[PDB]
Amino acid sequence: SGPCAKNSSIVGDSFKKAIRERQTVIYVQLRDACGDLLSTSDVQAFVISPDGSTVEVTMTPRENGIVALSYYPSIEGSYTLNILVKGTPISGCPTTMDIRRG
């Protein structure tokens, strides 16, 4: 039946914090309407930097409905993340990610 936005979510809260100029990975668990894990044309993910620019997000399909989202935050500050399943934000989206120089 494909992924269900309300049942799909980001794995953990590690995504809330990241380091500038380091390739960063966020894991998303896709679940159908029944809550079952899948098993990706229905999934969209974008990241906006603190100056309003789009950041390229790479999505790699993994086993049993996990999708790895990778991005490279070039500047410090408050990034915006949104992940849409069939045009609907998943649970917990859109959200903030704080990138530090650390």
Numbering used by the authors: 691 to 729, 758 to 820
What is written in the article reporting this PDB entry?
One previously isolated lin-41 allele, ma104, is a transposon insertion into the sequence coding for the filamin domain. We found that the ma104 mutation resulted in an insertion of 16 amino acids into the filamin domain. To gain a mechanistic insight into the ma104 mutation, the filamin domain (residues 691–821) was subcloned, overexpressed in bacteria, and the protein purified to homogeneity. The protein was crystallized and the structure determined at high resolution (1.68 Å; for data collection and refinement statistics, see Table S1). The final crystallographic model encompasses residues 691–729 and 758–820, whereas a long insert (730–757) that is only found in Caenorhabditis LIN-41 protein sequences could not be built due to high flexibility. We found that the LIN-41 filamin structure exhibits a classical immunoglobulin (IG)-like domain fold consisting of seven β-strands arranged in two antiparallel β-sheets. Importantly, the 16-residue insertion present in the ma104 allele maps to the mid-section of the second β-strand and is very likely perturbing the filamin IG-like fold. Specifically, the 16-residue insert will prevent completion of one of the β-sheets resulting in solvent access to the hydrophobic protein core of the IG-like β-sandwich and thereby severely destabilizing the fold. This makes it very unlikely that the filamin domain of the ma104 allele is properly folded to exert its biological function.
LIN-41 belongs to the TRIM-NHL protein family. These proteins contain a TRIpartite Motif (TRIM) consisting of a RING finger domain (commonly endowing a protein with E3 ubiquitin ligase activity, for example), two B-Box motifs and a coiled-coil domain. Additionally, they also carry six so-called NHL repeats (named after NCL-1, HT2A and LIN-41) and may contain a filamin domain, which have been implicated in both protein-protein and protein-RNA interactions. To understand how this reprogramming is controlled, we searched for C. elegans mutants in which the activation of embryonic genome, a landmark event demarcating the switch from a germline- to embryo-specific transcription, is initiated precociously in germ cells. This screen identified a novel function for LIN-41, a member of the TRIM-NHL protein family, in preventing a premature onset of embryonic-like differentiation and teratoma formation in developing oocytes, thus ensuring a successful passage between generations.
